[PDB]
Amino acid sequence: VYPCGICTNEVNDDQDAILCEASCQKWFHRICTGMTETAYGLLTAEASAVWGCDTCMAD
Amino acid sequence: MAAKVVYVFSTEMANKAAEAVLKGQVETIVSFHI
Ligand SMILES: [Zn+2]
Ligand SMILES: [Zn+2]
């Protein structure tokens, strides 16, 4: 049972989800982050890229 | 003791990089130019 770092609801297997590897290590709904399907597609396909949530990037 | 460089994207940066691959302007999302 993983709470969405943004909206705080469960992150089920049937949804689009992404992990902050900048720091906080939380899972988030792709929808909640504001990340487009295309950005998701490309970022997860890209070997040398990782994602960071917005609070994690601010500091 | 192998080390590697990983580029971290914000959501904004990701959405921008994706728009740029869609509009053929860049190869990939890590194709940073100056
Ligand atoms: Zn959410
Ligand atoms: Zn984070």
Numbering used by the authors:
A (entry chain A): 340 to 398
B (entry chain B): 172 to 205
What does the original paper state about this entry?
Pygo and BCL9/Legless transduce the Wnt signal by promoting the transcriptional activity of β-catenin/Armadillo in normal and malignant cells. Molecularly, BCL9/Lgs proteins function as adaptors between Pygo and Armadillo/β-catenin, by binding through their homology domain 1 (HD1) to the PHD finger in the C terminus of Pygo, and through their homology domain 2 (HD2) to the Armadillo repeat domain of Armadillo/β-catenin (Kramps et al., 2002; Städeli and Basler, 2005). We show that human and Drosophila Pygo PHD fingers associate with their cognate HD1 domains from BCL9/Legless to bind specifically to the histone H3 tail methylated at lysine 4 (H3K4me). Therefore, this is a prime example of histone tail binding by a PHD finger (of Pygo) being modulated by a cofactor (BCL9/Legless).
In one of our PHD-HD1 crystals (space group C2221, WT2), where two binary complexes are seen in the asymmetric unit, one of the N-terminal hPHD ends was inserted into the peptide-binding pocket of the second complex, thus behaving as a pseudoligand. The structure of the free hPHD finger (Nakamura et al., 2007) shows a dimer in the crystal, in which the PHD-PHD interaction mimics the PHD-HD1 interaction that we see. This PHD-PHD interaction may thus merely reflect a propensity of the hydrophobic loop2 surface to undergo a pseudoligand interaction in the absence of bona fide ligand, similar to the pseudoligand interaction we observed between the hPHD N terminus and the H3K4me-binding pocket.
